[PDB]
Ligand binder design. Structure first.
Ligand SMILES: O=C(O)CNC(=O)C(=O)O
Ligand SMILES: [Mg+2]
Ligand code: NI
Ligand SMILES: [Zn+2]
Length: 331
């Protein structure tokens, strides 16, 4: 079995290997990359996402989200308070202000220590989930707006044509902006490209151990767990590496830098934080190997998770027994 300790693998494809996206994902899996739940892909030196980032300041963040924490430093939830619209240039200035800027630090590990010590005492503002793309249309390789769609994959595998679309999303971050522990909708893959700015640190639980994280989460967030049998779908719970280690949960960590891709694999729980002002692009995708994960994915039906239009067909076709309850939660 390849990668039996479920380590995060880092790949350096050549320009030739960067042509065929699907083929390269399957190659990474042949080497056991998916066992970790997360892989890093460093693009060939010949590649670029676009020419420059000099002209992005006028993008609008219609609904910036202030991420307010509750709990203890290593075990907390966050809720998202909506703020007034602002442009990316305005958000960048805000991120760099004395109130929000990255503190002085020695290295990534010192900054990680400071994150976990101090995160709850601040409320950073995240420009998340903005439909759009920063890839140039002429970028042919690993262009996250030109991937094969999940609806086409389901149709190719299973023969059923379905409605829905699959487009990328932009994320503008600042110091301490946080992504809570989650797997993707329908336990899909994700791919995330860090276009510019400061790093993003990731934590990940191997897919084969995801239920260990779920059991811990039920223990640590006992009211939330009574509320919903899949409350991690709400994307609000944080557990620190120290708490995971105290509780014996297998996990790994890695820091993504600008110019790098990360892929999350089906049922790979992940969480993390941004080091300072940055911009990422991410999208979900599927492969043949996903179908079995999609059929088994948990679902939130309590009403909290509320998701895209295109999840309807995935539930309807892959999980017809669950569909009526889930759809009630959507309405
Ligand atoms: O970058 C973020 O805030 C969160 N991203 C992801 O969870 C992802 O790409 O799957
Ligand atoms: Mg602009
Ligand atoms: Ni994710
Ligand atoms: Zn729920």
């Amino acid at each position: 079995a390849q990668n039996p300790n479920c380590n995060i693998m880092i790949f350096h494809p050549t320009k030739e290997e960067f042509n065929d996206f699907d083929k390269y994902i399957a190659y990474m899996e042949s080497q056991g990359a998916h066992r970790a739940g997360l892989a890093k892909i460093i693009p060939p030196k010949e590649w670029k996402a676009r020419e420059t980032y000099d002209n992005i300041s006028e993008i609008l963040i219609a609904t910036p989200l202030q991420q307010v924490a509750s709990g203890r430093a290593g075990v907390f939830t966050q809720y998202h308070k909506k703020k007034k619209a602002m442009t990316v240039g305005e958000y960048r200035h805000l991120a760099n202000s004395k109130k929000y800027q990255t503190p002085p630090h020695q290295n990534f590990e010192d900054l990680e220590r400071k994150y976990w010590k101090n995160r709850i005492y601040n409320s950073p503002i995240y420009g998340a989930d903005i439909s759009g793309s920063l890839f140039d249309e002429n970028t042919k390789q690993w262009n996250l707006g030109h991937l094969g769609t999940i609806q086409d994959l389901l149709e190719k595998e299973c023969g059923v044509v379905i409605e829905g679309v699959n487009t990328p999303y932009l994320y503008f971050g600042m110091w301490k902006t946080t992504f809570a522990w989650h797997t993707e909708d329908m336990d899909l893959y994700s791919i995330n490209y860090l276009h510019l700015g400061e790093p993003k640190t990731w934590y990940v639980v191997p897919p084969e151990h995801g239920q260990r994280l779920e059991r811990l989460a039920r223990e640590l967030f006992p009211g939330s767990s009574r509320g919903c049998g899949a409350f991690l779908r709400h994307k609000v719970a944080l557990i620190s590496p120290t708490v995971l280690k105290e509780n014996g949960i297998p996990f790994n960590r890695i820091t993504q830098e600008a110019g790098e891709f990360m892929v999350t694999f089906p049922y790979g729980y992940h969480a993390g934080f941004n080091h300072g002002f940055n911009c990422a692009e991410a999208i979900n995708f599927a492969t043949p190997r996903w179908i079995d994960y999609g059929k088994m994915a948990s679902q939130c039906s309590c009403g909290e998770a509320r998701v895209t239009f295109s999840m309807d067909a995935f539930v309807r076709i892959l999980q017809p027994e669950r569909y009526d309850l889930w759809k009630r939660g959507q309405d």
